[PDB]
From Swiss-Prot, chain A:
One of its GO terms (biological process) is cytoplasmic translation. The chain holds residues 24 to 105 of 108 of the full protein. Component of the small ribosomal subunit (SSU). Mature yeast ribosomes consist of a small (40S) and a large (60S) subunit. The 40S small subunit contains 1 molecule of ribosomal RNA (18S rRNA) and 33 different proteins (encoded by 57 genes). The large 60S subunit contains 3 rRNA molecules (25S, 5.8S and 5S rRNA) and 46 different proteins (encoded by 81 genes). GO terms for cellular component: cytosol; cytosolic small ribosomal subunit. Disulfide bonds: none annotated. The gene is RPS25A. The keyword ATP-binding does not apply. Keywords: Cytoplasm, Methylation, Ribonucleoprotein, Ribosomal protein. It is presumed that the precursor part of S25 is engaged in assembling of the small subunit, thus being essential in ribosome maturation. Present with 322000 molecules/cell in log phase SD medium. This is Small ribosomal subunit protein eS25A. GO terms for molecular function: structural constituent of ribosome.
Curated annotation (Swiss-Prot), chain C:
The lineage of its organism: Eukaryota, Fungi, Dikarya, Ascomycota, Saccharomycotina. This is Small ribosomal subunit protein uS13A. It comes from the Eukaryota. It comes from Saccharomyces cerevisiae (strain ATCC 204508 / S288c) (Baker's yeast). Component of the ribosome, a large ribonucleoprotein complex responsible for the synthesis of proteins in the cell. The small ribosomal subunit (SSU) binds messenger RNAs (mRNAs) and translates the encoded message by selecting cognate aminoacyl-transfer RNA (tRNA) molecules. The large subunit (LSU) contains the ribosomal catalytic site termed the peptidyl transferase center (PTC), which catalyzes the formation of peptide bonds, thereby polymerizing the amino acids delivered by tRNAs into a polypeptide chain. There is a cross-link at K35, K48, K79, K95 (Glycyl lysine isopeptide (Lys-Gly) (interchain with G-Cter in ubiquitin)).
Curated annotation (Swiss-Prot), chain D:
GO terms for cellular component: 90S preribosome; cytosol; cytosolic small ribosomal subunit. Residues 121-141 are annotated as: Disordered. It is found in: Cytoplasm. Component of the small ribosomal subunit (SSU). Mature yeast ribosomes consist of a small (40S) and a large (60S) subunit. The 40S small subunit contains 1 molecule of ribosomal RNA (18S rRNA) and 33 different proteins (encoded by 57 genes). The large 60S subunit contains 3 rRNA molecules (25S, 5.8S and 5S rRNA) and 46 different proteins (encoded by 81 genes). The gene is RPS16A. This is Small ribosomal subunit protein uS9A. InterPro entries: Ribosomal_Su5_D2-typ_SF (IPR020568), Ribosomal_uS9 (IPR000754), Ribosomal_uS9_CS (IPR020574), Ribsml_uS5_D2-typ_fold_subgr (IPR014721). Component of the ribosome, a large ribonucleoprotein complex responsible for the synthesis of proteins in the cell. The small ribosomal subunit (SSU) binds messenger RNAs (mRNAs) and translates the encoded message by selecting cognate aminoacyl-transfer RNA (tRNA) molecules. The large subunit (LSU) contains the ribosomal catalytic site termed the peptidyl transferase center (PTC), which catalyzes the formation of peptide bonds, thereby polymerizing the amino acids delivered by tRNAs into a polypeptide chain. There is a cross-link at K28, K45, K57 (Glycyl lysine isopeptide (Lys-Gly) (interchain with G-Cter in ubiquitin)).
From Swiss-Prot, chain E:
Belongs to the eukaryotic ribosomal protein eS19 family. Present with 29000 molecules/cell in log phase SD medium. This is Small ribosomal subunit protein eS19A. SUPFAM superfamilies: Winged helix' DNA-binding domain. The keyword Ribonucleoprotein applies. Keywords: Cytoplasm, Ribonucleoprotein, Ribosomal protein, Ribosome biogenesis. GO terms for cellular component: cytosol; cytosolic small ribosomal subunit. The gene is RPS19A. Component of the ribosome, a large ribonucleoprotein complex responsible for the synthesis of proteins in the cell. The small ribosomal subunit (SSU) binds messenger RNAs (mRNAs) and translates the encoded message by selecting cognate aminoacyl-transfer RNA (tRNA) molecules. The large subunit (LSU) contains the ribosomal catalytic site termed the peptidyl transferase center (PTC), which catalyzes the formation of peptide bonds, thereby polymerizing the amino acids delivered by tRNAs into a polypeptide chain. Gene3D superfamilies: Winged helix-like DNA-binding domain superfamily/Winged helix DNA-binding domain (1.10.10.10).
Length: 82, 100, 145, 141, 143, 117, 53
RNA sequence: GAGCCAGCGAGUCUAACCUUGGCCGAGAGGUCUUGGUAAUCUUGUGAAACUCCGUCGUGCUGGGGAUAGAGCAUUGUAAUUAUUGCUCUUCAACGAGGAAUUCCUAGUAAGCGCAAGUCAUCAGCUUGCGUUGAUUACGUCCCUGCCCUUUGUACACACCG
């Protein structure tokens, strides 16, 4: 059963699924000093899912942490309040 | 009275001078008329393989048939209606009259 | 808008119908790990149980998931329209079932055994392991085993 | 009667007929305003003819465009050509020829297909391939 | 100036009019709702389960306002999509007939749409009187 | 228990009717008796009654030869041996009660399985 | 006996045949002319079908 | 979920084809009427890709839907080696593919559907038609073919001589 490929796996990190106190103030304290805020940066620096990233993004934009540039679906583009 | 002449041939040049001779013979008898409405020409296409067997390169072939259809609407007492359709019948051109 | 502190009751694993359902996903997609329930059915039970479908599997209350499993195991008594069940109008009992987890595997072997026991054509095709739905076999499924 | 002209813009199969008459200045596309044309990106494409010449030449005329045929992005290009030609036709008939030429030049400098229809037509499909140029597959063994 | 249904974006007017439906609470929703999936080509039932009859009703209300008359056969073609036929190529497949016929019956009850001569359903003058009024209401929201 | 075909047991079904058996039949069998009143069942069933009498108990009857393999196994034929034509031969099959709602064709294979060796 | 020529011929390839050569294969049923594909190609010019493109 | 736009075409009478609209049904379908021998009616063939808002959140995963089990319908004299359609369930390989190799120069390639042909039923096929629409080149004989010139020939059913 020769296959003529190699087929190595990957590391498959465990990004957080429900949000708790240690994640909550961590997003509260470091969404400033982010020049550009989106779903994918929040996944990479905070280890939360796209679910949490999209809902938290909606959360901040009414109360005040991040300013919007563009509110198109599947791509949210956010800047800092200086 | 509202009679209507409809032409449905495939030969365009036979059809036209048939249609022209209807409308010109109308005007010696001075009848008001809807001048010929030309409906969209409809093409009957048949796409077959050239070969009788199934060998060779797959060359197809499209035979088509164009049908031209015109109608002229006329209002006339009976004697002109008997005269106009009795003459100017050209072979391969189909003429039929409907009233109202 | 709604951020919510999840608490210490949460479960990374849960057991319904003898299967280790993983947590950390939405409840309807999570219960599809249990055999005999697929995405359509899973939506209807959690709808008929009046649970918030937005929740993850690991955070749902103890009474709610036992309420869910009752609606799965007695479906048509709780107003499921019963052409929605998989094994309806059954060959011995006459009544509409809905096999779950092990029943699906065990009852599938049994009705195979009838066709093998009466020597019906489909049963003999299963005993050889070949196709039974009238497929061509001259090229496809070549390295099946 | 009332000063009015009638133009059309085209694209691959889309045709948009435009009635340009003298009015108060509203520019409607299929009974709906010009700001409602659904594909959000190319809406900013249909603003550009009036955005080129300035909105001042659209105060005293009102525009109706009726759109049929083709597809979504083809319908957009037929709309913009119809209003650009309709404006240049209005200044041809009523206003002097000076206003026509400054109108025409600004259009024709920016994009030539605002006034001239694109002549690119579909190429017939040929037996032996899925397309007009493509063939299906040659195999030798 | 006489604002109308044509003068407002399709999305937000349908959303606003459907919310008018949810508050009014008088629609005669069928009863098989949240069990059906509303198209034979569809793969799931509507994710927004607690409405979507009100969404569909607002959607169908604007269509008779635009057009002259519709039937239920037209609406199934409009709301149908491509059915992924497994390993075969896709195909247009019509939507669930009951869903269109019932909401058209349901809109008859509130008095928006009526029967038409020459067949089909026509917007009544009650329908042509309140759809404008939400259209006035929904278009000053951003102003 | 003994076999109850979809909740109806042997004490009714061995002689209840052909016609109420189709009330409990699946779609295909209901469709078959929805349309079609030919005398091809008629002649076969009368010869079925003949073969039952000439057998006593502790005799399985004589195998009745048929061509038609599209005849649904009705509960009237339960307990007989039928020679089904598979294209060149007549195959011996006993009609069980558990082979109800099937055609005769499913039990006389039309091909000889390949071996490659 | 009555059993001769008794199988139905209401639909299928057995119901139709070329009006010229009584063949079953390659029939052309468009526009109701019902001539086989090799016989139509021999008769297309005098029926009125021509090649243009 | 919401928006929402083509073109090529086919269609019954001494037959029952294209089917609008109303009603029943989750569906596939059933039933009552109607229009059409057709630029008139199906039919704006409201096609799909697409567009806007939402759930998913790198997981062989809500990717993929093969292979199996139960029912409900439709065509047909008949559907078992499941005709086809619908529902529910089961939910495999496959993580972009070695040596090899095909087609192509602008409304073209490629994506995406629809009609027609075969057709009682059945399209993953073909013939056409539209929809969305690139990159690259505007060369050369390097490879592979074909043609020509010069040349040698003891060949001429002609180098398989
Ligand atoms: Mg060959
Ligand atoms: Mg109206
Ligand atoms: Mg079409
Ligand atoms: Mg399986
Ligand atoms: Mg190479
Ligand atoms: Mg393609
Ligand atoms: Mg030499
Ligand atoms: Mg020699
Ligand atoms: Zn012939």
């Amino acid at each position: 059963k020769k296959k003529w490929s190699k087929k190595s796996m990957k590391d498959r990190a465990q990004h957080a699924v429900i949000l708790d106190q240690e994640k909550y103030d961590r997003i509260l304290k470091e969404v400033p000093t982010y020049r550009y805020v989106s779903v994918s940066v929040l996944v990479d620096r905070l280890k939360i899912g796209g679910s949490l990233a999209r809902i938290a993004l909606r959360h901040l934009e009414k109360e005040g942490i991040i300013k919007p540039i563009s509110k198109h679906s599947k791509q949210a583009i956010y800047t800092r309040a200086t | 009275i509202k009679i209507r002449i409809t032409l449905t041939s495939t030969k365009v040049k036979q059809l036209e001078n048939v249609s022209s001779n209807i409308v010109k013979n109308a005007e010696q008898h001075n009848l008001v008329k809807k001048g010929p409405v030309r409906l969209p020409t409809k093409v009957l296409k048949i796409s077959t393989r050239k070969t009788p067997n199934g060998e060779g390169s797959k060359t197809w072939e499209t035979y088509e048939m164009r049908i031209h259809k015109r109608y002229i609407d006329l209002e006339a007492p009976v004697q002109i209606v008997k005269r106009i359709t009795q003459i100017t019948i050209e072979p391969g051109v189909d003429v039929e009259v409907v009233v109202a | 808008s709604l951020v919510v502190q999840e608490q210490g009751s949460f479960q990374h694993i849960l057991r319904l119908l003898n299967t280790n359902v993983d947590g950390n996903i939405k409840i309807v997609y999570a219960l599809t790990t249990i055999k005999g329930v697929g995405r359509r059915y899973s939506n209807l039970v959690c709808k008929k149980a009046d649970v918030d479908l937005h929740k993850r599997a690991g955070e749902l209350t103890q009474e709610e998931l036992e309420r869910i499993v009752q609606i799965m195991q007695n479906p048509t008594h709780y107003k499921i329209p019963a052409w929605f069940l998989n094994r309806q109008n059954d060959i011995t009992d006459g009544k509409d079932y809905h096999t779950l987890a092990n029943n699906v595997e065990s009852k599938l072997r049994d009705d195979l055994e009838r066709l093998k026991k009466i020597r019906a054509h489909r049963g003999i095709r299963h005993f050889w392991g070949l196709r039974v739905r009238g497929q061509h076999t001259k090229t496809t499924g070549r390295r099946r085993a | 009667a009332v000063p009015s002209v009638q133009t059309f813009g085209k694209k691959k199969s889309a045709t948009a007929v435009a009635h340009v008459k003298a009015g108060k200045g509203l520019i409607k596309v299929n009974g709906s305003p010009i700001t409602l044309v659904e594909p959000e990106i190319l809406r900013f494409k249909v603003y550009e003819p009036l955005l080129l010449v300035g909105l001042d030449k659209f105060s005293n005329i009102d525009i109706r465009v009726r759109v049929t045929g083709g597809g979504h992005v083809s319908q957009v290009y037929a709309i913009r050509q119809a209003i650009a030609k309709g404006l240049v036709a209005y200044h041809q008939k009523y206003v002097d020829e000076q206003s026509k030429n400054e109108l025409k030049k600004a259009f024709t400098s920016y994009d030539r297909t605002l006034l001239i229809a694109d002549s690119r037509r579909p190429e017939p499909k040929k037996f032996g391939g899925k397309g007009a140029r493509s063939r299906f597959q040659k195999s030798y063994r | 100036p006489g604002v109308s249904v044509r003068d407002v974006a399709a999305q937000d007017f349908i959303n606003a009019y459907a919310s008018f439906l949810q508050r009014q609470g008088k629609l005669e929703v069928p009863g098989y709702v949240d069990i059906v999936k509303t198209s034979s080509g569809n793969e799931m039932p509507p994710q927004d389960a607690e409405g979507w009859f009100y969404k569909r009703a607002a959607s169908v209300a604007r269509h008779i306002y635009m057009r002259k008359q519709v039937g239920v056969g037209k609406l199934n073609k409009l709301y149908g999509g491509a059915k992924s036929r497994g390993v075969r190529p896709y195909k247009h497949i019509d939507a669930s007939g009951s869903i269109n016929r019932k909401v058209l019956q349901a809109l008859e009850k509130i008095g928006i749409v009526e029967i038409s001569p020459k067949g089909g359903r026509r917007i009544s003058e009650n329908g042509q009187r309140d759809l404008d009024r939400i259209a006035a209401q929904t278009l000053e929201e951003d102003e | 228990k003994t076999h109850s075909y979809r909740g109806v047991d042997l004490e009714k079904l061995l002689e209840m009717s052909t016609e109420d058996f189709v009330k409990l039949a699946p779609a295909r069998v209901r469709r078959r008796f929805a349309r079609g009143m030919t005398s091809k069942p008629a002649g076969f069933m009368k010869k079925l009654r003949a073969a039952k009498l000439a057998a006593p108990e502790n005799e399985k009857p004589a195998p009745v030869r048929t061509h038609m393999r599209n005849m649904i196994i009705v509960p009237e034929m339960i307990g007989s041996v039928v020679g089904i034509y598979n294209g060149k031969a007549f195959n011996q099959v006993e009609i069980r009660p558990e082979m109800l709602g099937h055609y005769l064709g499913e039990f006389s294979i039309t091909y000889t399985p390949v071996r490659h060796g | 006996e009555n059993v001769w020529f008794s199988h139905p011929r209401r639909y299928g390839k057995g119901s139709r045949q070329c009006r010229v050569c009584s063949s079953h294969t390659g029939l052309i049923r468009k526009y109701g002319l019902n001539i086989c594909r090799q016989c139509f190609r021999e008769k297309a010019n005098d029926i009125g079908f021509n090649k243009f493109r």
